[PDB]
Amino acid sequence: AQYEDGKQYTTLEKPVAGAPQVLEFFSFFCPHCYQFEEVLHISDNVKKKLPEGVKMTKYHVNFMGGDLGKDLTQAWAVAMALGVEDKVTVPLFEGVQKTQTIRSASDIRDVFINAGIKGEEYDAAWNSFVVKSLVAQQEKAAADVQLRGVPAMFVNGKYQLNPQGMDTSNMDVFVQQYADTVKYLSEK
Numbered sequence: 001a002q003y004e005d006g007k008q009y010t011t012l013e014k015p016v017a018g019a020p021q022v023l024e025f026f027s028f029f030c031p032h033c034y035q036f037e038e039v040l041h042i043s044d045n046v047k048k049k050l051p052e053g054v055k056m057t058k059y060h061v062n063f064m065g066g067d068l069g070k071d072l073t074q075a076w077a078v079a080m081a082l083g084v085e086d087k088v089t090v091p092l093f094e095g096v097q098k099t100q101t102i103r104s105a106s107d108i109r110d111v112f113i114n115a116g117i118k119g120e121e122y123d124a125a126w127n128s129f130v131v132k133s134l135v136a137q138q139e140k141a142a143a144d145v146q147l148r149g150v151p152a153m154f155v156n157g158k159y160q161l162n163p164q165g166m167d168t169s170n171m172d173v174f175v176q177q178y179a180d181t182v183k184y185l186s187e188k
Helices: 031-040 042-047 066-082 085-098 105-114 119-126 129-144 171-186
Strands: 009-011 022-026 056-060 152-155 159-161
Touching: 022 031, 022 042, 022 129, 031 042, 031 085, 031 171, 042 056, 042 171, 056 066, 056 129, 066 085, 066 105, 066 119, 066 129, 085 105, 105 119, 119 129, 152 171, 159 171
Parallel strands: 022 056
Antiparallel strands: 009 159, 022 152, 152 159
16 A cells, blocks of 8 residues: 555554544654754644644653753643743754753753743743643653654554655655655544
8 A cells, every 4th residue: 555554654552542643752852853843844744734623742751861851841841831832942952952051950941031931930830730740641641652762753542653664855755745644644
């Protein structure tokens, strides 16, 4: 067929019940994730092609960057709680990987302040139990698919995108194949 298990996607041995419809995992430490987000704009091109009634979820992971990695998962929970993902994603990626000016929880916080989130508001969220449960959700989602690498995308808790089985000679064409594959899996 044109789409084949084991080629553009894989099937989870152990399907995950009640999983988000489209679930993407990343780390601000992850070099391919940087490419996916700032150069390829994967999350965005996927959404443009998702059928109506299909929601997209994006979670940060702990297993890269040690202590700072965990802080970033909590900051990403803060980002989700305040709904400011589209304001902090670029400066966090560049702060960790481009300028390398993010070295501590305080440096992460600076990114939010610079993005116009007020200090009291950031700190309140950071220390909130709503953010604690959002950290819990991120961890549990990754745990449910035995996640050992990023970037990763899962559709309906049963299919895992397989980008290594795609031509990367043209960046535009890779992105649409990725997006079209997600659309296909979504309609499965």
